[PDB]
Design an enzyme around this catalytic site. Structure first.
Site, short mmCIF file in Angstrom:
data_model
loop_
_atom_site.label_atom_id
_atom_site.label_comp_id
_atom_site.label_asym_id
_atom_site.label_seq_id
_atom_site.Cartn_x
_atom_site.Cartn_y
_atom_site.Cartn_z
N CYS A 1 66.36 7.46 -92.59
CA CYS A 1 65.34 6.49 -92.93
C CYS A 1 63.86 6.95 -92.66
CB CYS A 1 65.64 5.15 -92.29
SG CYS A 1 67.32 4.54 -92.67
N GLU B 1 61.92 7.67 -90.05
CA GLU B 1 61.12 7.24 -88.89
C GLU B 1 61.10 8.20 -87.70
OE1 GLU B 1 64.21 6.08 -89.43
OE2 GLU B 1 64.99 4.78 -87.88
N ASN C 1 65.37 12.18 -89.78
CA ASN C 1 66.61 11.47 -89.98
C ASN C 1 66.56 10.72 -91.33
OD1 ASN C 1 64.69 9.46 -88.88
ND2 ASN C 1 66.47 8.13 -89.20
#
Ligand SMILES: Nc1ncnc2c1ncn2[C@H]1C[C@H](O)[C@@H](COP(=O)(O)OP(=O)(O)OP(=O)(O)O)O1
Ligand SMILES: Nc1ncnc2c1ncn2[C@H]1C[C@H](O)[C@@H](COP(=O)(O)OP(=O)(O)OP(=O)(O)O)O1
Ligand SMILES: Nc1ccn([C@@H]2O[C@H](COP(=O)(O)OP(=O)(O)O)[C@@H](O)[C@H]2O)c(=O)n1
Ligand SMILES: Nc1ccn([C@@H]2O[C@H](COP(=O)(O)OP(=O)(O)O)[C@@H](O)[C@H]2O)c(=O)n1
Ligand SMILES: [Cl-]
Lengths: 618, 610
Positions: free
Chosen positions: A310, A312, A308
């Site tokens: 960001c 993480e 995704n």
């Protein structure tokens, strides 16, 4: 202490005026734009009640008792939520109860009947999307590319952040059965950018291209608009491999299944290209996809190609993930982190996050399936920097990082034991049987190697051969917005600043903010004098007349050197089965050499990806 | 004379060197190596004729012991009119016919052709075998439908089509959107995604049509959008009767701007909206006007189906997911002794209509809905090119009532024999599926165009009645730009006057008819000045005759359109050229005369404006 009694100490504590602005701006539900919610209590209630309605689906509950059982879960959910000890990702807050009649979402729990929960379950509309993180594939055909642009727009519209690996796209100027000749990934990525530019939710997208794609150099320099993309360079091979090639000064062949185009580049020149760009602008990052598949229970029957936006969550094709975070700062009690109450919360939070899957609605059928089958959760933490301040532990110390690893290991242990149990009570994720939790012995979805808990964690993973609700449970998110609602530091990040003046609009104002922990610790008269300088300097470190112990403790992001950021990320990642959101802050005075040194150390630690932000670059 | 004889006159006239370069550049088939499979126009003609004749396999009126003969006969007739460059189909037919098919079947002698050979051409046409220039798709009011339409644009552009849409269903910018705090982005902003899609999918580039209706709340923004829609032609849609809009204008009335899924409302003076339209056209040429109501008035399946958009150059009004293949007759080659050889013309019109209808059968579309829309209506776009050159030969000045009455009669005669050809194909092969719900079946006296300017009118009315019973195609006629095919054909484009008689192409070019007519001791002053008007001692009779686009004033452009449009059942591509000194009021006056005449849309271009 009992979770009970910690709830008591927080449940009547209202959000700050700053959090309240964020809430009415964005979170409080509203025709033609009238507030249906005016207090955080209101949000907590609606979300509690909706996540609780998933207990309708519980095979281990008999029809009598179901209403009792459901209300019990609503009330705890509501209690941890209202207290702000745990908050789910924003989309859960935004969208829970969309489509449901307003008379049912806030109604006193007294008046809730079992057919009221049944009505909640069946009235969830096509916009009831409660998860933040998605990955879709981008196949090498005009059909699949443009289905994927559609998919981006549908995901975005509903409040998801989405990423893709664009490496399937044949290089620019490749042969097409057309026509012409292939535009190449970078130029198709502009269509995806153009699409998010018109789908206004209220860095946004992740786009990855692998290190051996012939267009990589173009991709590295692509942001130099593409303004809605975060970009990362993908390493689907093993980190060790790339390290060695680097160390010998070797060469890497750039090639592609569906092109004749091939080039040999020195790996150090490519690395230096990346580092130069990231030094200048913050992009692109590094995505060690091989490291993620190493720990992915379903690899190779499934494979992680992208994260995704960001970074993480590493997700297989069409997979999605819902997140939620515990405010560990609220867990401080007399020089210790209160583990008895933290254990109970991890238990509640895993159930909460797993119930969200059951009341979630996605706009694409493949995503619904991908999720039903794996049931990937992202439980993390926020308030960590503040917890350190309370414990008097410098963030940039081996002490902090050992504490970090023990804290995460504890959480990982009790998170996976809750998954064990949920698999027993409610049934296993469909893909348990083909995962490494079954087909292996001694499979652990993270490195470990820094905690007393390691054996017990090995024991848990072995037990989950039999019963397991979820493929994976843990992440550390940026928590940009839920950490503000909760009045705490973000994720595992240090505080960026201890003090700054913010501005209320009223009606027809500057109002000093000081870190609350700092406020409680420093002599109030020392505070009054130094405040001016702390705001101008952005740090206590060069301020004369501040005691040394304070100062060692109350470090901010730019007091902490890049290696000390990177090692903190390593400490957490050893006990997290998904990935981690960490910005490696660098001082304005860092060189492209310093950046390369970070990447090199990154290859030797257990980190799964890298983001660098050099102060003043952008 | 017989068409066969007219052919012999043209069959061995070789394409010019200019034409051959175009052909080598993008029409001659190549192999995987980039080596040429085709080196000559004759090879394209053989390939295309063979492929289009194979549609005769599906002919339910042929035996059993007969089909092979009849197919080779159609192939031969198609091959010869193609080679002669008397009729040429739209470019994609040229580019894409035979794709998927083995090379030894494609250029093989007609006389060595076996029935199994045709059956194997037919079975082996691939997903790229796309033979039509003109598409329309809906863009519905949801993110889902918008980005499905963007996918469709892509897929259509990939296989070589031009696509158009009406964006008016999209709710105005700033509209409430359920379940979010963001407002609707609005049509203009969403068009950006279509443009960016096409910027990245090579066709040799496609311009797009984008229409927004005059009563949409974002209409003013739409009019101004072109000073990042660099790929769009932009037209204002007028779904109401042209009479109603003309009246509203003359009465200095108001238009309610509204949308069914928005509270955004406004009232604007029609003269003021028209003035902005006119100011922007004066500046830059865009937006033009699309008289969708006038189109629907003559639409045989209206109101059950409706035309909401044109394809990129406006010549075909198309209902949703509908597409259309075009072809053009070079009328200039039909000149014989001070007359048009109507004997030869009637035969080529009959052949052309069949050729066009057979293309539907061997055509392959990339979307199932377009496949269904085309099977169901079988709409054709038979036009002409060479019209201005044909006027040169007849010694008729393009800007004269004589030229317009000649065009009316000529378009009338073509319409007559095209529609008669459709009756017969209807009878021989089966009617178009939708005949029976169409106004040829449900009205009496339905005629798909205004007529009013010809001796042929009553005979046309009779053929229309006949087609209550048998009718292959919903509509048949258009006038296209012919921007590449009139070049291949070495003739003037569509119905347009020649833009110039001499233009560098270091090359350099002189109109062929002026060349065989002007005393060959009579040029430098024409390439620079752009006209013959102000060269003296060029006889005044050449000159009246040899007029170019800018010698012809705006109303003579517009009345020429009208004269043809009265006998065309689809629309017409005509740019109304204006002198550099024309004013915004001169544009408005074109608009008003347009609303009074029978034209179906307007494009103005004012000289030196770009
Ligand atoms: N017309 C075009 N313009 C630009 N790029 C194109 C075009 N057509 C295809 N491409 C690019 C997009 C994809 O990355 C790739 C292949 O697309 P496409 O040809 O649709 O796949 P395919 O699998 O159907 O055909 P192929 O036989 O060429 O592999 O080339
Ligand atoms: N987030 C957004 N940003 C900008 N425009 C949007 C956004 N969401 C929707 N729109 C636009 C696209 C269309 O013109 C219109 C409706 O889109 P969409 O909400 O998908 O329709 P819908 O039919 O799903 O509506 P509903 O949810 O009302 O049933 O609003
Ligand atoms: N414009 C964006 C950017 C990121 N995101 C997603 O939000 C996820 C978690 O970000 P976060 O923890 O800061 O979210 P909240 O604090 O707002 O819940 C990211 O990993 C992205 O997947 C999004 O939904 N929209
Ligand atoms: N570059 C182009 C040119 C024309 N076209 C299509 O061709 C129609 C006819 O244009 P035209 O008659 O000049 O084209 P040719 O057959 O001469 O190339 C247009 O309205 C478009 O639908 C296209 O798709 N792309
Ligand atoms: Cl074309």
């Amino acid at each position: 202490m009992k979770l009970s009694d910690l709830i008591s100490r927080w449940i009547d504590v209202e959000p700050s005026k700053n959090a309240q602005i964020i809430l009415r701006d964005r979170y409080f539900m509203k025709l033609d734009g009238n507030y249906l919610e005016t207090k955080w209590e209101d949000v907590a209630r609606r979300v509690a009640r909706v996540v609780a309605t998933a207990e309708l689906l519980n095979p281990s509950y008999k029809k009598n008792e179901k209403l009792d059982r459901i209300k019990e879960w609503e009330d705890i959910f509501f209690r941890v939520l209202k207290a702000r000890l745990f908050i789910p990702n924003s989309p859960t807050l935004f969208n829970a109860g969309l489509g449901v009649k307003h008379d049912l979402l806030w109604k006193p729990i007294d008046q809730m009947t079992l057919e009221d929960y049944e009505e909640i379950y069946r009235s969830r509309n096509h916009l009831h999307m409660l998860s933040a993180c998605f990955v879709v594939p981008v196949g090498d055909s005009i059909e699949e590319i443009f289905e994927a642009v559609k998919e981006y727009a549908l995901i975005t519209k509903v409040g998801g952040g989405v990423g893709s690996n664009f490496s399937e796209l044949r290089p620019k100027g490749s042969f097409v059965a057309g026509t012409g000749k292939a535009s190449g990934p970078v130029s198709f990525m502009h269509v995806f950018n153009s699409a998010i530019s018109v789908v206004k939710q209220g860095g946004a997208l992740m786009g990855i291209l692998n290190i051996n794609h012939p267009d990589i150099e173009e991709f590295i320099d692509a942001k130099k608009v593409l303004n809605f993309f975060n970009l990362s360079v993908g390493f689907p091979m093993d980190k060790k491999e790339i390290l060695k090639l680097y160390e010998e000064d070797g060469e890497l062949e750039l090639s592609h299944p569906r092109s004749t185009i091939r080039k040999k580049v020195k790996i150090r020149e490519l690395f230096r290209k990346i580092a130069t760009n990231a030094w200048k602008s913050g992009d692109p990052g590094l995505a060690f996809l091989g490291e993620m598949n190493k720990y992915y229970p379903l690899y190779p029957h499934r494979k992680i190609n992208s994260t995704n936006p960001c970074g993480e969550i590493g997700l297989s094709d069409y997979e999605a993930c819902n997140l939620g975070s515990i405010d560990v700062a609220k867990f401080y009690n007399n020089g210790f982190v209160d583990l008895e109450a933290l254990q109970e919360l991890v238990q509640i939070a895993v159930r909460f996050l797993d119930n969200v899957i059951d009341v979630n609605v996605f706009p694409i059928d493949k995503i619904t399936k991908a999720v039903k089958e794996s049931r990937r959760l992202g439980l993390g933490i926020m308030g960590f920097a503040d917890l350190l301040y309370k414990l008097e532990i410098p963030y940039n110390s081996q002490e902090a990082r050992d504490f970090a690893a023990n804290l995460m290991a504890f959480i990982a242990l009790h998170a996976h034991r809750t998954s064990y149990e949920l698999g027993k009570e409610k049934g296993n994720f469909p893909l348990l049987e083909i995962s490494r939790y079954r087909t292996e012995d001694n499979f652990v979805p993270f490195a470990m190697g820094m905690s007393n808990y390691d054996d017990e964690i090995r024991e848990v993973m072995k037990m989950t051969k039999e019963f397991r609700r979820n493929v994976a449970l843990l992440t550390i998110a940026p928590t940009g917005s839920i950490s503000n609602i909760a009045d705490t530091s973000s994720g595992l990040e240090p505080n960026f600043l201890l003090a700054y003046t913010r501005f209320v609009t009223k009606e027809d104002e500057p109002l000093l903010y000081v870190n609350q922990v700092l406020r409680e610790k420093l002599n109030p008269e020392i505070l009054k004098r130094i405040e001016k300088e702390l705001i101008e300097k952005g740090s206590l470190k060069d301020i004369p007349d501040v005691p040394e112990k304070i100062k060692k403790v109350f470090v901010v992001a730019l007091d902490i050197d890049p290696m000390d950021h990177l090692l903190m990320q390593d400490a957490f990642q050893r006990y997290v089965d998904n990935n981690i959101s960490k910005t490696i802050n660098m001082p304005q005075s860092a060189t492209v050499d310093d950046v390369l040194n970070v990447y090199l150390e990154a290859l030797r630690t257990n980190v799964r990806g890298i983001t660098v932000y050099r102060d003043g670059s952008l």
